[PDB]
Amino acid sequence: ADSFVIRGDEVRQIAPGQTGNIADYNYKLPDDFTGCVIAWNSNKLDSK
Amino acid sequence: ISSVLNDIFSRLDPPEAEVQIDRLITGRLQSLQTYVTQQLIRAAEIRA
Numbered sequence: 001a002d003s004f005v006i007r008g009d010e011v012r013q014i015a016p017g018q019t020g021n022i023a024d025y026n027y028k029l030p031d032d033f034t035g036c037v038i039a040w041n042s043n044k045l046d047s048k
Numbered sequence: 049i050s051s052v053l054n055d056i057f058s059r060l061d062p063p064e065a066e067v068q069i070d071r072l073i074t075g076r077l078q079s080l081q082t083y084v085t086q087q088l089i090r091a092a093e094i095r096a
Contacts, residue, residue, distance in 0.1 A: 017062040031062045 002027075005046065011039050 006014075006022060013020040014037055016029040023029070049068060050056055056068045 005042065014039075 004027070010020065010022045012018075013023045014027070014029070016031060016033045050059070051072070053069065053072070056065050056072075059065075060068065
């Protein structure tokens with residue numbers, strides 16, 4: 001299991017076989033990947 | 049969508065690219081199979 005926080009409209013860029021700044025330079029996924037991916041909003045608990 | 053493997057790979061994401069690769073590979077295999085079958089049939093009359 002892995003956990004982190006991203007800026008919000010890069011959530012679709014996490015998926016396998018996709019490119020961009022975040023998924024290119026900080027977290028990459030293998031081509032053949034089986035696990036599940038989860039996300040939710042933390043504005044009220046995180047932005048200040 | 050296209051008849052060039054590297055074009056498929058560059059333009060699409062790995063799953064969909066795999067789908068196209070399988071499509072082309074099955075088509076080419078079946079075509080070669082037809083060639084071999086006709087040739088086998090012809091060889092029999094040549095031998096007669």
